[PDB]
Write an enzyme that holds these catalytic residues in place. Structure first.
Site, PDB file in Angstrom:
ATOM      1  N   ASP A 149      28.644  62.269  53.788  1.00 41.04           N
ATOM      2  CA  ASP A 149      28.681  62.611  55.218  1.00 41.04           C
ATOM      3  C   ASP A 149      28.929  61.259  55.976  1.00 41.04           C
ATOM      4  OD1 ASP A 149      26.953  65.447  54.984  1.00 41.04           O
ATOM      5  OD2 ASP A 149      25.961  63.729  53.329  1.00 41.04           O
TER       6      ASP A 149
ATOM      7  N   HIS B 217      28.160  66.004  45.009  1.00 45.34           N
ATOM      8  CA  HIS B 217      27.455  65.964  46.256  1.00 45.34           C
ATOM      9  C   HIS B 217      26.571  64.728  46.560  1.00 45.34           C
ATOM     10  CE1 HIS B 217      24.567  67.857  49.164  1.00 45.34           C
ATOM     11  NE2 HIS B 217      25.636  68.186  49.861  1.00 45.34           N
ATOM     12  N   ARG B 218      27.202  63.875  47.590  1.00 41.78           N
ATOM     13  CA  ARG B 218      26.570  62.609  47.838  1.00 41.78           C
ATOM     14  C   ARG B 218      26.664  61.648  46.548  1.00 41.78           C
ATOM     15  NH1 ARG B 218      21.074  65.098  50.866  1.00 41.78           N
ATOM     16  NH2 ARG B 218      22.296  66.978  51.765  1.00 41.78           N
TER      17      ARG B 218
ATOM     18  N   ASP C 260      25.166  68.575  42.898  1.00 46.31           N
ATOM     19  CA  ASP C 260      24.381  66.995  42.622  1.00 46.31           C
ATOM     20  C   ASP C 260      24.263  66.726  41.361  1.00 46.31           C
ATOM     21  OD1 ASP C 260      23.372  67.144  45.619  1.00 46.31           O
ATOM     22  OD2 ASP C 260      22.112  69.085  45.193  1.00 46.31           O
TER      23      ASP C 260
ATOM     24  N   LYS D 296      28.995  65.287  60.620  1.00 48.30           N
ATOM     25  CA  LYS D 296      27.894  65.969  61.074  1.00 48.30           C
ATOM     26  C   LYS D 296      27.959  66.635  62.307  1.00 48.30           C
ATOM     27  CE  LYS D 296      24.035  65.266  59.348  1.00 48.30           C
ATOM     28  NZ  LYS D 296      23.502  65.921  58.353  1.00 48.30           N
TER      29      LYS D 296
ATOM     30  N   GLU E  78      31.499  64.154  47.540  1.00 46.88           N
ATOM     31  CA  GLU E  78      31.284  65.091  49.076  1.00 46.88           C
ATOM     32  C   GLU E  78      30.193  63.805  49.449  1.00 46.88           C
ATOM     33  OE1 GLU E  78      28.381  65.617  50.553  1.00 46.88           O
ATOM     34  OE2 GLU E  78      29.188  67.130  52.066  1.00 46.88           O
TER      35      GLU E  78
ATOM     36  N   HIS F 167      23.383  60.999  55.072  1.00 48.67           N
ATOM     37  CA  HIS F 167      23.194  62.411  55.333  1.00 48.67           C
ATOM     38  C   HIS F 167      22.426  62.732  56.721  1.00 48.67           C
ATOM     39  CE1 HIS F 167      21.412  66.393  55.099  1.00 48.67           C
ATOM     40  NE2 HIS F 167      22.712  66.594  54.820  1.00 48.67           N
TER      41      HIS F 167
ATOM     42  N   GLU G  28      32.389  65.081  55.496  1.00 47.98           N
ATOM     43  CA  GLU G  28      31.671  65.946  56.388  1.00 47.98           C
ATOM     44  C   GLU G  28      31.275  65.123  57.623  1.00 47.98           C
ATOM     45  OE1 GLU G  28      28.078  68.302  55.104  1.00 47.98           O
ATOM     46  OE2 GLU G  28      27.876  68.823  57.291  1.00 47.98           O
TER      47      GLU G  28
END
Ligand code: CA
Ligand code: CA
EC number: 3.1.4.46
Lengths: 243, 239
Positions: free
Chosen positions: A37, A8-9, A230, A112, A35, A50, A110
């Site tokens: 954004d 995650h990120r 994370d 937004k 993952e 994000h 992703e």
């Protein structure tokens, strides 16, 4: 088969989120993907960050959409997490594709869905993915399923994942109707009924954000296709059973 | 014809989820109220939003760790203002007692999140049946599994599907679950959603709408009801 570990990120627990450094660390740790954004700058460039504002993760302030690419590149996206990461920048999407190259590494992107609207982001994202030959290695997700419907209509071969926190009953019907590759539910939603229903219909499951060891163990036992976390390092060791 | 549903009572002017807030909503001329139910340690239905009492009261800790006697010691009004000192966390029974025979809607949300409340669906249906509120209540929740249990145990009760997710053609899900209404985050209210819901007989209750301009757009969109923290402004706008 082993559950996929999606950072995650990037490896956000140990490295500044949504940076090339964090994505690179996830790759080095042996994660199966990342993952991230995507948002647009004022001059229409796809950047990886994000929040709708640069405030939290950088030494700057203001909405991402108000910064041009040149202006947003002057900001420090690493210093707020540690002195060792000083100078780390807000990536473009191209930089992420360039970092991975031809490697078999999944990129869950992703789009937004907050107050800030991004006109033409779907078309721009599709073109970027195709330009770097990332069609098979990408899962485009969003809480705004209308955006994913447009992506599926304009590029049917790309995989879309439906993000949701809502406690939906039998959501696989909706997923199949939208021709979705996967459902990305908040991990609390991962229960036997949901797993069985998705497995019987060929709908993949990618729960998020799983950071606690106990929850990681339950997600692996539940048999989901991938886990967004994370902390990839801790999950990788559990998935590999210490091997 | 647009229902004014006061979110946690008149929460803009009076401490949220209190008898005083619900009473003010009734006095302003609102069509109904929205509230959150949780269970105490000893299994009583109480009205409070957060799973912890910290934000709205002078106490600390999870609602599920407080017995009804202990939770009634807390002040749920002082933090909002000195004028409301002494106001307590109400039981669902007190809310029904305040309304009485008045034709006033009660949108009850069963809390989802992290804390599980065993038997809350059964306790809610029995409380509604005891005070004859069957037709004046819409039971909502982000946990639709909870609403599936309510629909099975008491089919006559209206259920509303709460969601913030940007769902496409959600009326298929609504009809499948025999839902009376969809309760979307108000960003989701667009022509496609309204027309699709109206064609399938599914009602819409967007939340939470506080800005006058947003209220105007919701009324023009044709929603059945608006869940708002400011009923006064919406009531005066419909006038
Ligand atoms: Ca994200
Ligand atoms: Ca509520």
């Amino acid at each position: 088969m082993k559950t996929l570990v999606i950072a995650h990120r990037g490896d956000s627990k140990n490295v500044p989120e949504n940076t090339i450094a964090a994505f690179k660390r996830a790759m080095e740790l042996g994660a199966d993907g990342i993952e991230l954004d995507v948002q647009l700058t004022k001059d229409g460039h796809l950047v990886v960050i994000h929040d709708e504002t640069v405030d939290r993760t950088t030494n700057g302030e203001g909405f991402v959409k108000d910064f041009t690419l040149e202006e947003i590149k002057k900001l420090d996206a690493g210093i707020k997490f540690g002195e060792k990461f000083a100078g780390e920048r807000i990536p473009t999407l191209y930089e992420v594709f360039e970092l991975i190259g031809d490697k078999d590494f999944l990129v869950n992107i992703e789009i937004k869905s907050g107050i800030v609207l991004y006109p033409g982001i779907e078309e721009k994202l599709i073109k970027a993915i195709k330009e770097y030959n990332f069609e098979e290695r990408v899962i485009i997700s969003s809480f705004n399923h209308y955006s994913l419907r447009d992506v599926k209509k304009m590029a049917p071969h790309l995989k879309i994942g439906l993000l949701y926190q809502c406690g939906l009953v039998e959501p696989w019907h909706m997923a199949l109707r939208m021709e979705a590759y996967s459902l990305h539910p908040f991990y609390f939603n991962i229960i036997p009924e949901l797993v069985e229903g998705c497995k019987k219909n060929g709908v993949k499951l990618f729960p998020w954000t799983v950071d606690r060891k106990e929850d990681m163990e339950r997600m692996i036992k539940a048999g989901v296709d991938g886990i967004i976390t994370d902390d990839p390092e801790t999950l990788i060791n559990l998935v590999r059973k210490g091997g």
